[PDB]
Design a binder for this molecule. Structure first.
Ligand SMILES: O=S(=O)(O)c1cccc2cccc(Nc3ccccc3)c12
Length: 133
């Protein structure tokens, strides 16, 4: 069940996002702006289709997908990837593949907060969000 992930989420803490972006080859100026931007994640459901929006003053993205079914995605940093999102241990696990590389975006609810763990190479970033009323 994906339902406790649904809603509007505001970033309240970030650890090692620069390391994660740098590992992906993101340029210094984008990392600089990204490091001070407050993003919002919106997750909504219509039947088996999830839509995940990222809104900010800098980058904005939107994806729609069915759990367990691969989809094409063009990321905020312009990578063209093959993606799949699955529930695993109650976590929303998003795997992206491109050029033989992989990165995971794992979302877990802890005490009503959404904890996003981003891993690429050796870099591990933890971004925490709080629900908007
Ligand atoms: O969407 S994210 O998943 O964070 C994202 C994931 C992976 C790489 C990213 C690189 C630059 C900016 C992002 N987003 C961003 C969006 C709004 C504000 C600041 C950064 C990246």
């Amino acid at each position: 069940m994906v339902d406790a992930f649904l809603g509007t989420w505001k970033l309240v803490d970030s650890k090692n996002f620069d390391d994660y972006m740098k590992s992906l080859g993101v340029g210094f100026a984008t990392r600089q702006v990204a490091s001070m931007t407050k993003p919002t994640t919106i997750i909504e459901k219509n039947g088996d289709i999830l839509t995940l929006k990222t809104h900010s003053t800098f980058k904005n993205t939107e994806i729609s997908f069915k759990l367990g079914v691969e989809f094409d995605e063009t990321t905020a940093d312009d990578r063209k990837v093959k993606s799949i999102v699955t529930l695993d241990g109650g976590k929303l696990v998003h795997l992206q593949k491109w050029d033989g590389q992989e990165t995971t975006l794992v979302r877990e609810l802890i005490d009503g907060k959404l904890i996003l763990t981003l891993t690429h190479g050796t870099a591990v970033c933890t971004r925490t969000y709080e629900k908007e009323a």
